[PDB]
Symmetry: C3
Subunit: 106 residues, 3 copies
């Protein structure tokens, strides 16, 4: 998928998580976020379209998604243990990383 | 190790997982696949040898192993929980990633 | 942070894990190591400043942190299961990755 589509997946599934009632819904939503974050790694944001895929900005962009993936991992395992409110809180701290990337590259 | 040898390791241990009887066997084979996928990620595939190392294709190639690694992660945790058939089903799901990369970069 | 600061974080927190009494201490040190490894991924080591950012050497460098991150993952889950001594053993194993990178790129 293209970058904007993966971002919609991330935004929609974060909201699913905030409204979720059980761990199965949280896990499903986090797994869709993980897929979207991985697919976004191959993308070039519009503000960097003319730069090298290996420029420091593009390597930083891709590390941003690795950071997000490890945060998704933490929430996924919290949900797996049945700690639904903890998984939802961990999902909320993802926004720190969403915003940090947006500030630089959106 | 070189890319062909790492792919040998991935294919051999996928077959071990398919025929395994117990969780320890599945977990051992998955651990070897994780190691091979990481070692493979540093390679330049022959199809991309004559392209720029800074090409989008090289970045995409490496994201494919990141997808594979997160799928291996799921199967590893299922095997760690002792869920042999669920871990085998998660390992079966790797094949779509294997073939999708091959279609582009073998 | 720069590479040297991230290396300090990794080394200091490994020392904490080596002297830890309980899983909470180990998990806290391992999460700080995970953050430093992700941050180090954006660095260029002095020895590779004369290489392309997409050169095989720089890919090897960045993938070395992926290897470390999955080893940090193993120790984190072992600590989460209450296997403190097994987590410490896994952190000891991590050191082979640190030294192998230093041998190549320091
Ligand atoms: C970089 C490492 C990013 C991370 C982490 C996240 N996002 Fe993002 N986002 C990024 C870019 C470069 C862009 C611009 C895309 C464009 O073509 O303009 C975006 C954009 C969005 C959008 C708007 C997309 C659209 O349809 O117009 C949304 C709704 C969005 N991002 C959400 C989002 C969330 C919820 C994230 C974390 C959970 C997140 N992004 C992470 C880069 C990066
Ligand atoms: C890209 C991200 C890949 C993923 C994921 C997987 N494979 Fe692969 N594979 C890839 C390439 C570029 C190549 C060509 C290597 C060459 O030098 O020609 C291969 C090759 C194989 C092979 C044949 C090896 C040989 O002796 O030539 C096998 C048996 C193989 N790959 C198996 C395999 C399996 C089982 C995978 C998923 C579990 C898998 N590969 C993923 C690129 C990528
Ligand atoms: C590459 C993939 C590395 C891995 C994995 C680890 N380290 Fe490292 N480290 C690396 C380099 C290239 C350098 C040289 C940095 C420089 O600017 O000279 C280092 C350096 C250190 C240092 C000293 C830094 C300084 O103050 O001069 C320490 C204490 C250190 N590294 C520790 C360390 C630990 C504990 C690691 C694993 C847990 C580890 N490093 C991994 C490259 C890489």
């Amino acid at each position: 998928a293209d970058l904007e589509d993966n971002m919609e997946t991330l935004n929609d599934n974060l909201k699913v998580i905030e409204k979720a009632d059980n761990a199965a819904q949280v896990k499903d939503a986090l797994t869709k976020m993980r897929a979207a974050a991985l697919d976004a790694k191959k993308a070039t944001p519009p503000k960097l379209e003319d730069k090298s895929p290996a420029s420091p900005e593009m390597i930083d962009f891709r590390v941003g998604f690795d950071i997000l993936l490890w945060q998704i991992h933490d929430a996924l395992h919290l949900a797996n243990e049945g700690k639904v409110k903890e998984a939802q809180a961990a999902a909320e701290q993802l926004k720190t990383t969403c915003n940090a990337c947006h500030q630089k590259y959106r």
